[PDB]
Amino acid sequence: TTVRKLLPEAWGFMCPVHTPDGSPCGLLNHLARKCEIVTHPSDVSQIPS
Amino acid sequence: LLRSTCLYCHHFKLSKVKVHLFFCRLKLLDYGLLNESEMVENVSL
Amino acid sequence: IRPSFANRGTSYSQYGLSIRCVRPDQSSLTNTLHYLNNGVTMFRFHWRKNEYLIPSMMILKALLETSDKEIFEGIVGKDLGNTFLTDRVELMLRAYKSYGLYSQTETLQYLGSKFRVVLGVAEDLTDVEVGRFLLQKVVLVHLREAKDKFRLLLFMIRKLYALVAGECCADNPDSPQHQEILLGGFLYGQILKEKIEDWLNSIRAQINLDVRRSAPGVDFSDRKYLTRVFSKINNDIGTKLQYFL
Amino acid sequence: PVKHISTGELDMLGPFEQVYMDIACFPKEIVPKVSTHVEYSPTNVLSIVANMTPFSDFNQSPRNMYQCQMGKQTMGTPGTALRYRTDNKLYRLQTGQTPVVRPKLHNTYGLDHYPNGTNAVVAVISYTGYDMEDAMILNKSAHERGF
Amino acid sequence: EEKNIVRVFRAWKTAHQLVHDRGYGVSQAELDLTLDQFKAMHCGMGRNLDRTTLSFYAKPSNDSNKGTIYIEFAKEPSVGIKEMRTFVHTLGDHNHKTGILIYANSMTPSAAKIIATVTGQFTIETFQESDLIVNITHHELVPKHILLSPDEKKELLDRYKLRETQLPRIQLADPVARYLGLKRGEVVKIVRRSETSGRYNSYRICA
Amino acid sequence: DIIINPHAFPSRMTIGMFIESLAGKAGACHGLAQDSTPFIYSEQQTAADYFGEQLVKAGYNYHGNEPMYSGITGQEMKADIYIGVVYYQRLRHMVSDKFQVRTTGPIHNLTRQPVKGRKRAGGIRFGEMERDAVIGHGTSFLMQDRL
Amino acid sequence: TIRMHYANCNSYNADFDGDEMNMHFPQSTNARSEAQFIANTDSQYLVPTSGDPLRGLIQDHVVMGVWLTCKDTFYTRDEYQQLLFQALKPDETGMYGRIKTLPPAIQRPGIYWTGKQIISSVLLNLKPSDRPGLNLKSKAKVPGKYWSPDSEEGSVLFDDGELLCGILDKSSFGASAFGLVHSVHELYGPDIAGRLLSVLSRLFTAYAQMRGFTCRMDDLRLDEQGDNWRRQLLENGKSFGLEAASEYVGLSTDSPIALLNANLEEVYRDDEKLQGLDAAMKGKMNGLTSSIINKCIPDGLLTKFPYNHMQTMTVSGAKGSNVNVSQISCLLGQQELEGRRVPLMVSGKSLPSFVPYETSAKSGGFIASRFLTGIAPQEYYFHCMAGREGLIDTAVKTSRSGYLQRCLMKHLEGLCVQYDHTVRDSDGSIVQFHYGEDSLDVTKQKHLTQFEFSAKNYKSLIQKYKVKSVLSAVDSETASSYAKKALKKPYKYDPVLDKYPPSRYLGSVSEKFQRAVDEYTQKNPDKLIA
Amino acid sequence: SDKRASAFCKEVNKLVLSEVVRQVRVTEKTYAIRLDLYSRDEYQDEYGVLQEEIESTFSNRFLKILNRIIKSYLAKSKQNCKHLDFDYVNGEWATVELVFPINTEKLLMVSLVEKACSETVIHEIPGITRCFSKPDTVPKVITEGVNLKAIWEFYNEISMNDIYTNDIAAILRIYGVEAARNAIVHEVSSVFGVYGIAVDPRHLSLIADYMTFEGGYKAFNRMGIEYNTSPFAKMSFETT
Amino acid sequence: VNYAARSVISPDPNIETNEIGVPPVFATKLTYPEPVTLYNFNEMRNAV
Amino acid sequence: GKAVAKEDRTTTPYMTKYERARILGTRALQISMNAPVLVDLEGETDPLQIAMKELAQKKIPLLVRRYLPDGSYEDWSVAELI
Amino acid sequence: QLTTLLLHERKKVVRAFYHAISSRKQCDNCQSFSPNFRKEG
DNA sequence: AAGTACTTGAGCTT
DNA sequence: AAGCTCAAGTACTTAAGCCTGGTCA
RNA sequence: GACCAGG
Ligand SMILES: [Zn+2]
């Protein structure tokens, strides 16, 4: 009954309700409606500066 | 069984008298007599 | 904290420190710290489906030409002589002083003569830069600068001792807190990079075979040689991708 | 994404700030001196398919889970370009129509191009006697007029 | 402090109770002994002074079957090889069929094989002290056990057309077997008191 | 058009469906598209009350009820009945999955037991618990027959 | 697609949502013969783990039974004839020439039969050729108070086959023994019990067609007085959480916030103290829940008991329980996921919406809103957690019985009961003499303890047992004589079952059985004369 | 009485030397360890083990175990108590001075002593711990672990009314086979009552009375399989 | 096993508690032998 | 082994839940194989309901042998059973 | 002048047989030390 | 992962 | 010496039924 | 036969 649990630090990240019934129940957590996946990195040298 | 073999001896690593005790155990078990099998050990020499 | 750690390494403990480092091109690998009951910590890494197990003081002295006092004041820089850390670091330091060497050169040559066989590096070119190569390739990749690898590894060993020191909770890596998503295209790029590394190493082995036969055609300046070599080896990687998909 | 309260503009955060930020979920729930962030609209919490199940907050969560996992298998319109699709088994629902009850996001994502089922005048009643043990009935005239 | 003098007091209510239960007969007061009753029985200068006189016997109410029983306690820890075999000729002149022994602790294994071989038609049986000092057969989780005559065993073997290898068994390391004086081969008749429907009587053997 | 069963709503907690019924009978009457996103309607005023105001505007009962005469007897049902406008997204399990019959057919190369099909007219499996069932029933002949 | 009847369903354990069943067909005649006789559906009426009946009529039929047996229902000639006939359906089942009816319970000034009169009419028209009438008194499911303080329905009482008083419900006919259908199975034999179950089925069906029954919305809503009662009760439960938590850690309610938070931080780094905390918190919350449910749900809600079509289905036992209407109508209560309660994230704020170290019950897994009115988001997430836990447990459990039924047939493979009446293994060894005295294998031993039942009628049971043919061949006097000798308190007498096997000697019974019949004759001598 | 009841409770329960001891500082150079101990009043609050008991048993067995485990760390590094001073009067400290060669590597001393504390027990019946009192006017004591031998000696409670969670192996070893038989019948009935499902004791009694057919008790795995007369079953079931 | 069909199953209250529905396809396709005697020749005649 | 004599029979005289089944079955099969109908038929067609019509009249052949677990048997006619 | 409990004893004899045979190294008859043997999976 | 029974070596006693 | 019970440690098979689809080399 | 699906 481990990581197949819907432990709450997902609020708005990956949907709590929708995840299939049956064997894979609790594993595949479909992303929330608006949680993107940021894939284009950025420049951050100004951050150490 | 190979471990139990004695190559030069071609008898058992066990004492023959003990293997014959074992033999009597099964001989008397064949007809189904349980306490009668544990009886036969009642000898001390 | 996961039980397999200790009973894999019976001197070992469940206390471990994991880090998933990733180069700028998203070609990540994981190198973890396994702590052992004695007080030393071994610096797990994994190369070519092969486990590998090196002590942290070793790699730490190998990285920078350093003074051991810098090592300690990097580990337990605080509140001078806090008993727990100032004793565990003493024990580790003596334990590595046991059978190791002193200088960066000597340690690097130790490591190089050790690893040369499994590493697919050029059979000849060097052995010192092989040491500066292993610390380039496996220990800590996301950090480009050596000194920064050094500072971060000090951070890491301090945090691990703190973890045994009970002042830090057990992180629960199976939560969306410490979790991330591998997109499709990144895996695609990594598999393409791997198939290309295989292709290069394969034509390398092929030219090595041509040198191995006796010397059937040997002129490394002539182009006709290379078009022949390319003719021999399988030159398709796209079909490998299509089979993958 | 969320809305920042001390300013009035967008702000995005990842899976560290959640555990350490007092993210108010209702404009009226905001308590000052603590709440640093406000959610746009808690609709933004669920997923896509789960969102389009009307009154999804009146159901016992196992049932919303069943309806989610089972709406992903409706015999609905898999699109509109079917002349040029060589897929193996396709299902097309000849007469589908828009739900009379629909969460506005159901129009925003533009599902109306892709309806899934029909709208039936369902009378909750135990009259036929056949419709027990989770079954149901189907008015024959509607079944032959093109349900 | 001085509780050890209770351990051996509670060693006659595990022994004088261990009588019938075999078919014998003993005076009905040696079972209801009060605590100080024993101290009045076995006296000395102490106040420790319990040993050197703890030995009795009994004659069966079976009145036959060759023969009777004699109870004797070797209180000295580690009975050994010089207190097992010397206490056999004393059984032999007494013509007692089977006797008892207690010990705390550890009847030595070297003095555990050589003993049962000379007993022959007699048999020493069996116990040690500090383990069986509370009557076992007295509880809700144990039935009353009864032996069977060869006629009584023939009864079972006939009414069921059985073989003595088809009836359920009891091992001899069992406290109720060593308690009854069972030998390997005789059928005991047990009273399953399970409150489902009445209580019936099952049987078992030993081997 | 479709009769659902009352005894199915408790033990499932799909009261959201009754709310959907109200909403649909409200929307169809006037010509509205009832917005049913989660979390809109709070405890102060129920969604039921809002949709009921709508309905009593339209003309029908306020709890959603409606008087229905039965069909085969002609007299009214003593108690009113519930009629809503739900969205029945048809599912996909009808005939392919359902029925396979094996009178006589192809067999196994090795042991001449019928094959594992539904494409090769394969037989159904009967054993390793079906055996326990009969051999509890005390039907040794049925066991020896089927097995 | 094949078709079956509702009754068998609860046996096969199907929901008929679209699950599928193997149909077989034994070819030869030996096989189908033994099947038709040993395993005909009605002849499997008692599930053999216990005695209670596993078949029964279900949801629509049972609540419409509570609506037909109720005394408020009156039928005229036309409806009564029609309904009785729909219940019987003679020709296809057969066996009868012409149906016989009862006279009307009330006659002037209009002839109106009552419902229980119709249940009695059915019980009559299935009467065997010559078997004396049934009689029974046994408690019903729907407690009487729902009808009235000191109402008489309560317990179904019908002598000589007529429902004098007592409405039928789950218990009377369904998955509950000592009701109608079970005693009919006893007295009249099983091949009649099945026809009876079918007849009550079609009967309540035709009635539903006449009358109708729906689970309509207004059944859920609280009346304004009731709902403000609940809102006041929760206004009082504004704080219970902080009080209980500060009490468990021990600090006062006006405690310093800093010390309170520091204590809480000390609380859930360790885990056993959390089990204590949650025990105390769930204690106080279950108290609050008991309070508000107990005031609201039976009295607050809009419609009363009978006219309410959901409280009917709930309290009758068709589907659901009292907790279901509780959740639907008043509050949901604490959500306990894998035991204790909600899991905390590292920083101690159970959800990112709640401030760190929350003590209000709102973050303890307690949720105030009710399904009808609509649950809030914060609470919704916890409910999702608990529901999903339910699913991932029920899924991953069904593999736990995955090795035991390949364990308990290697060692209980044959274990047949030979004609010596002494259960043996197949090899030949004895395991249980007389099967723990058995009284039977449990599937029929049930009515022994119902010693009042037989003495109540006694005229039909004697004909069932067929005394004239049985007393002939079997021995009676000797074992009955020895029964007393075995009941002698001193020993040396076996249990009578060992001396005289219970097959032929019509005198042996276990001890407790004879003790029961004796101490019943002496304890309850009211029915037996003198 | 209730006071004597709680007295027996604190008696049969084992104290572990850790549960009494406070922080353990080890001053070094030679070699020196100091164990803090709480006041006698709180000491008898939780307890009722006497100061002289601490003195004697602590000294002897604490010494031995510390010796053994420090030898353990020494032998692992390869890959003694000359001075002992207990608080002979006040019972508030315990110092020990030991000498070790300088070549031996540094030792994790505080952890070693913390383990040794938990690794020594004063009054522990072999195989029992954790005695508790729970609410019927038939007051009974819950005990974690099993020692029928230990409960024989205790006459503060009846030697008859000893209810057991199964441990049927143990009681079969010393109470009979019918003991274990009725034990497992009671056990399974108790397991199946906690849910309101009915399992009439005919089936459970047959399951029991077969499970102990041999006269011992056989589990429902490879053990019982190897005994049947059917060479087809045993070959079908687990390891063909 | 042969002679054994399978389907998804709907409920019917009208038949009996004994009886089970059989669709026409299972009837027409599930076969079983019947010896032929003097008195059911008529039925088998109609059958063939 | 032995074939138990009529004078002493231990078995239970009740036509069990099983002997009824097998007796009626094999009898129905017999009568299906053009066998002697020992009772005037009622026009009934099924080769098994004839068997029940016969067993109700207790005019059936086929004594049954009840194997005791020893290896002996008792041979009971169907009329003799209850 | 098979059956169940037979196997219970006939397996006990097998286990005792091994416990006896494999323990001995030198010949009890010959007094020699016949060479040891090493295997592989 | 769970846990089982299996087998070999090192320390103590005659 | 060496016999012989004691200890952790090395090899080693199971994990519900069905049923239906699909892709695959 | 193996990996994703699904009741
Ligand atoms: Zn030799």
Could you explain how this protein is built, in words?
The structure is cut from a larger assembly and holds four copies of chain A, five copies of chain B, one copy of chain E (207 residues) and one copy of chain J (82 residues). Chain A has no helices and no strands. With 49 residues, chain A is low in regular secondary structure. Helices cover 44% and strands 0% of the residues of chain B. Chain J has one domain. Chain J has two helices and two strands. In chain J, strands 1-2 form a two-stranded antiparallel ribbon. The two termini of chain J are 27 Å apart. At the A-G interface, loops of A face helix 15 of G. Strand 6 of chain D pairs parallel with strand 1 of chain F. Bound molecules: zinc ion. Zinc ion (ZN) sits at the interface of chains K and B. Chain G binds three DNA and RNA strands through loops. Chain E: Component of the RNA polymerase I (Pol I), RNA polymerase II (Pol II) and RNA polymerase III (Pol III) complexes consisting of at least 14, 12 and 17 subunits, respectively. Chain E: It comes from Schizosaccharomyces pombe (strain 972 / ATCC 24843).
Q: What tags apply to this protein structure?
A:
part of a larger assembly; 11 chains; B: 45 residues; mainly alpha; 44% helix; J: 82 residues; alpha+beta; binds zinc ion; DNA-binding; RNA-binding; phosphoprotein (chain J); DNA-directed RNA polymerase (chain J); DNA-directed RNA polymerase activity (chain J); nucleus (chain J); DNA binding (chain J)
